[PDB]
Write a protein that binds this DNA or RNA. Structure first.
Ligand SMILES: [Mg+2]
Ligand SMILES: [Mg+2]
Ligand SMILES: [Mg+2]
Ligand SMILES: [Mg+2]
Ligand SMILES: [Mg+2]
Ligand SMILES: [Mg+2]
Ligand SMILES: [Mg+2]
Ligand SMILES: [Mg+2]
Ligand SMILES: [Mg+2]
Ligand SMILES: [Mg+2]
Ligand SMILES: [Mg+2]
Ligand SMILES: [Mg+2]
Ligand SMILES: [Mg+2]
Ligand SMILES: [Mg+2]
Ligand SMILES: [Mg+2]
Ligand SMILES: [Mg+2]
Ligand SMILES: [Mg+2]
Ligand SMILES: [Mg+2]
Ligand SMILES: [Mg+2]
Ligand SMILES: [Mg+2]
Ligand SMILES: [Mg+2]
Ligand SMILES: [Mg+2]
Ligand SMILES: [Mg+2]
Ligand SMILES: [Mg+2]
Ligand SMILES: [Mg+2]
Ligand SMILES: [Mg+2]
Ligand SMILES: [Mg+2]
Ligand SMILES: [Mg+2]
Ligand SMILES: [Mg+2]
Ligand SMILES: [Mg+2]
Ligand SMILES: [Mg+2]
Ligand SMILES: [Mg+2]
Ligand SMILES: [Mg+2]
Ligand SMILES: [Mg+2]
Ligand SMILES: [Mg+2]
Ligand SMILES: [Mg+2]
Ligand SMILES: [Mg+2]
Ligand SMILES: [Mg+2]
Ligand SMILES: [Mg+2]
Ligand SMILES: [Mg+2]
Ligand SMILES: [Mg+2]
Ligand SMILES: [Mg+2]
Ligand SMILES: [Mg+2]
Ligand SMILES: [Mg+2]
Ligand SMILES: [Mg+2]
Ligand SMILES: [Mg+2]
Ligand SMILES: [Mg+2]
Ligand SMILES: [Mg+2]
Ligand SMILES: [Mg+2]
Ligand SMILES: [Mg+2]
Ligand SMILES: [Mg+2]
Lengths: 271, 93, 46
RNA sequence: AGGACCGAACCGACUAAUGUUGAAAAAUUAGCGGAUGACUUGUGGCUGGGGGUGAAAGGCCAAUCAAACCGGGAGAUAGCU
RNA sequence: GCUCGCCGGAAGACCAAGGGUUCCUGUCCAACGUUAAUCGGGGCAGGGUGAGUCGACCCCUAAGGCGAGGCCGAAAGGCGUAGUCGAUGGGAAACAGGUUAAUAUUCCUGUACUUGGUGUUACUGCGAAGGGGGGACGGAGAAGGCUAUGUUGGCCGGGCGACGGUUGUCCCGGUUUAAGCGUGUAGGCUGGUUUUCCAGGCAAAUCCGGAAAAUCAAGGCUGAGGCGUGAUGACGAGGCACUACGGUGCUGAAGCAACAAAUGCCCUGCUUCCAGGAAAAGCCUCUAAGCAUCAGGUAACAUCAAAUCGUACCCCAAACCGACACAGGUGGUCAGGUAGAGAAUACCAAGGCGCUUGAGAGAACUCGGGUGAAGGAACUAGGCAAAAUGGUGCCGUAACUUCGGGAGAAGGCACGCUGAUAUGUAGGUGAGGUCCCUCGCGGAUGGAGCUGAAAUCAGUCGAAGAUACCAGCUGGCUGCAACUGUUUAUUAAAAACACAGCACUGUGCAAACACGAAAGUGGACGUAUACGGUGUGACGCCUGCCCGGUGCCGGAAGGUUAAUU
């Protein structure tokens, strides 16, 4: 639930927590874990290529099954779990043959539920089917872009995709951004929407809270000298410029998409 | 087995000092100046052969040479190795 | 007052040692220059 | 419970006096701030000069920084002393 | 040598880094030492560092480096696969006493332990570059059980006091002992066993995972400490002898108990929270190819091996970084007494020092301090500096408020010692004894002894009882910034930066964007509840009009317009 803290110190006054009692309390499933070290936003030349990244809490990577291609074998949900690496919760499922896998937890899922994937899976939340077999109008998540590649669309907490039309070998999706897009009907999707939909009601409350997530401070350009940023300089607070990125490109309205390879699939931009 | 040439050229000299004499009297130990690269096994074999005695064990240490000045120029004496050879309480060189 | 030279043998050898010099073309040029000059101590190793 | 409180170690550096050919090329003494955290510290590693890094002071990059240091072009040029 | 003073969470003792002979002995005093020097970290000569168990080396990996082929690049080169390196992390094993002028967990004495190779014997399904388990992991908090350690009593040895008293409820000293081995306790976790089956673990698997029955309910794992042994040993106050005066040799008493008690151990445990907390090997186990009365495996015994390098000395410092024998800097460990909440502070112990120029004098003036009549901010840019407040318990405490605060608001009272309550209380600890049982490191009862606040009453001394050291000045009005933080190393710490929150805008994933002639990499093993940029800056009430100018977004008829022809 959404819990407002008591203001017993200035750093607590505005904190709003998202508390889920259902999540597991113990350690995660060890066979499905690996190490991922932090980068600091540095690429392989050792240079900062994305700013405002660094520090934060150590995390381990939970191998999440995005393919969902273990067809025909039913599986049962064992427990919902906290995942450090994403905003959605993950569910540990046990297959009838003794295999265990992590999946994105859809909304409404709970321990003991049955899930299944394949062309003949029932139309239920958590069931994965090729979008050829999913009724038009359904809300799905973890959608694939190419057949067999793994879900890529609508993977964050509370997100979903709506199947709007089915015309031949292609379905038309309405993405969360509002964009209308075509994908092949052979791509799979998971029924229902991602859980943890109250993730956006949280309020970090204090600067340290954002530092715990690995976010470093942002220095405004207008607070620098001219040698550092196109916005720098001035005696007092001066701007007199059109706003731009640290590298000189207009930053309020100028469009940066340039991909002629994929424009065939974009039915309508997000507007 | 170690050849007799190596044994003939691993021992260099008997160390003579107050600690060496005390060790001989009390612990039945002789202190030797040995080749820089001789091992404990080689020292033990050479002592058993060239002096015809029976040895219990060998302890070794490397002594670092002193930096000296000989009329305004700095030299350095060479490192050398010494061995504490414990005999089998009946030999008494 | 913390001064600038804080000795560490491992770092000294890894940054200026003979094998760090020989690892690159420019390091080998450093060694060639110093041999031509006639330096008695070619690197920090000695 | 807490970027909670008072307060040593520890990390800082607000005031004053001294010192200013110093005990010291930035300290000392008396007070002062934080002191479970956006904390502090050891070891090793990465980022290289119109480049890095910067909770941004043009700050810092070996007592050097509105463009480091070393060598070279080089005996630059100097209607000036 | 005697006395005095100083440190004692260090100015003592160890380890790492760093240095490299500064360590010890003899000798010398030219130069060095801010003076003298017989002295020295100085000169000269000689001596000194002993390891199967400590560290490196070694096995294994992290970040990262290098990188066969490879991809990319005028050349040089860049990235990177298989690999191979890389500790600050994981991986076998030793303790006590003694000894040198200088080393000792290394030498000696006593008592141990680990790994590996061979050989003999007995039994026998062994085998990996593969599977599984394990190794293997956060912050905070709360106890309970312990020990290190201390105090007191008992015991043993000694004493009977330079000045009144001191055969006692007196004084001084000692009262120590390890690893290992046996025991498996306080406590923690976990149901056990058998059978059958199976789309899983790249193949197989008896192993792991899953499913179903039967049956038993106590079995397994982990574990400080104690106790026994180690140990009839060692050590031991002191005494006795020689001293060549530094010390050497010879004996050797008691060696117990209670209480208090850690920040150490059980504890990598338990409870809880969100920010969700390395890897790989050693290790256990399973099989594949393969082997097959071999090899190999298990167990007992015997025997051999455990190399090489470091080991002196300084190490909060005169030996390291600061040009100096320089008020500086420098990671980790140990941690006694009285008072105290305390690792603060004061005085001391063990231990270590008096800081490498002195001797006089007792002017101005400067530095660092003490006190001050009457006044009390009149000083000054400004209460700068100084003075003052300062503890614990209890009473009491306003506006305003985001209901938490404000608040230690403000203000006030008590405080020493002695006796009694009570020959030492409430409480804590807990022997003997008694009784039970699964006879044990057990349970119940029992309470000797030991330890022991706080309070009240009465008395009593002083000017003063939080007596020293230590230890908030308080209140009223107002600007700015919400707050904790950050910053001009070395004249600026702030109202500046950041911030949680808000908005706009870009981005459909081979994302936008950044680094890069490129290959690639970061974003991100993320997917619009996400990510980047820009502005604003908690919260409350709000955020009005202008699209002429300059940007940006959309349009695509018409005018103009490149290469080309
Ligand atoms: Mg950013
Ligand atoms: Mg922001
Ligand atoms: Mg500025
Ligand atoms: Mg500019
Ligand atoms: Mg202005
Ligand atoms: Mg203007
Ligand atoms: Mg030996
Ligand atoms: Mg050795
Ligand atoms: Mg605090
Ligand atoms: Mg100070
Ligand atoms: Mg404060
Ligand atoms: Mg404080
Ligand atoms: Mg400026
Ligand atoms: Mg500088
Ligand atoms: Mg320039
Ligand atoms: Mg020229
Ligand atoms: Mg010139
Ligand atoms: Mg004192
Ligand atoms: Mg010398
Ligand atoms: Mg000396
Ligand atoms: Mg003289
Ligand atoms: Mg002199
Ligand atoms: Mg000397
Ligand atoms: Mg690597
Ligand atoms: Mg190649
Ligand atoms: Mg490479
Ligand atoms: Mg390796
Ligand atoms: Mg290490
Ligand atoms: Mg010594
Ligand atoms: Mg005890
Ligand atoms: Mg502590
Ligand atoms: Mg030593
Ligand atoms: Mg001095
Ligand atoms: Mg000093
Ligand atoms: Mg420090
Ligand atoms: Mg103190
Ligand atoms: Mg005077
Ligand atoms: Mg004065
Ligand atoms: Mg007066
Ligand atoms: Mg007066
Ligand atoms: Mg007055
Ligand atoms: Mg006035
Ligand atoms: Mg006046
Ligand atoms: Mg003042
Ligand atoms: Mg004062
Ligand atoms: Mg005003
Ligand atoms: Mg502020
Ligand atoms: Mg400054
Ligand atoms: Mg300042
Ligand atoms: Mg990419
Ligand atoms: Mg602003």
């Amino acid at each position: 639930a959404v819990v407002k803290c008591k203001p017993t110190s200035p750093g607590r006054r505005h904190v709003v927590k998202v508390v889920n009692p259902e999540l597991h309390k113990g350690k995660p499933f060890a066979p499905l874990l690996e190490k991922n070290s932090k980068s600091g936003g540095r690429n392989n030349n050792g240079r900062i290529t994305t700013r405002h990244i660094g520090g934060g809490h150590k995390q381990a990577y939970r191998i999440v099954d995005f393919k969902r291609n273990k067809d025909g074998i039913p599986a049962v949900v064992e427990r919902l779990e906290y995942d450090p690496n994403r905003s959605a919760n993950i569910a540990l499922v046990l297959y009838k043959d003794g295999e265990r896998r992590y999946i994105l937890a859809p909304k409404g899922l709970k321990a003991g539920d049955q899930i299944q994937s394949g062309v003949d899976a029932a139309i239920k939340p958590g069931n994965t089917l090729p979008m050829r077999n999913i009724p038009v109008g359904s809300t799905v998540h973890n959608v694939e872009m190419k057949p067999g590649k793994g879900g890529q669309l609508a993977r964050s907490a509370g997100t979903y995709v709506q199947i709007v039309a089915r015309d031949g070998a292609y379905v038309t999706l309405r993405l969360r951004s509002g964009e209308m897009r075509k994908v092949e009907a052979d791509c799979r999707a998971t029924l229902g929407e991602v859980g943890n939909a109250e993730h956006m009601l949280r309020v970090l409350g204090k600067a340290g809270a954002a530092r715990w997530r690995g976010v470093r401070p942002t220095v405004r350009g207008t607070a620098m000298n001219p040698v550092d940023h196109p916005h720098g300089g001035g005696e007092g607070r001066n701007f007199g410029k059109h706003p731009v990125t640290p590298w000189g490109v207009q930053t309020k309205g100028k469009k940066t998409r340039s991909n002629k390879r994929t424009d065939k699939f974009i039915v309508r931009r997000r507007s | 087995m170690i050849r007799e040439e190596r044994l003939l050229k691993v021992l260099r000299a008997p160390h003579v000092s107050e600690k060496a004499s005390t060790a001989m009297e009390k612990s039945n130990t002789i202190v030797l100046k040995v080749a820089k690269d001789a091992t404990k096994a080689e020292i033990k074999a050479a002592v058993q052969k060239l002096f015809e005695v029976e040895v219990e064990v060998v302890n070794t240490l490397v002594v670092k040479g002193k930096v000296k000045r000989h009329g305004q120029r700095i030299g350095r004496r060479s490192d050398w190795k010494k061995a504490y050879v414990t005999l089998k309480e009946g030999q008494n060189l | 007052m913390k001064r600038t030279f804080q000795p560490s043998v491992l770092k000294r050898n890894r940054s200026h040692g003979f094998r760090a010099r020989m690892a690159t073309k420019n390091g080998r040029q450093v060694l060639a220059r110093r041999r031509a000059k006639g330096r008695a101590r070619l690197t920090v190793s000695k």
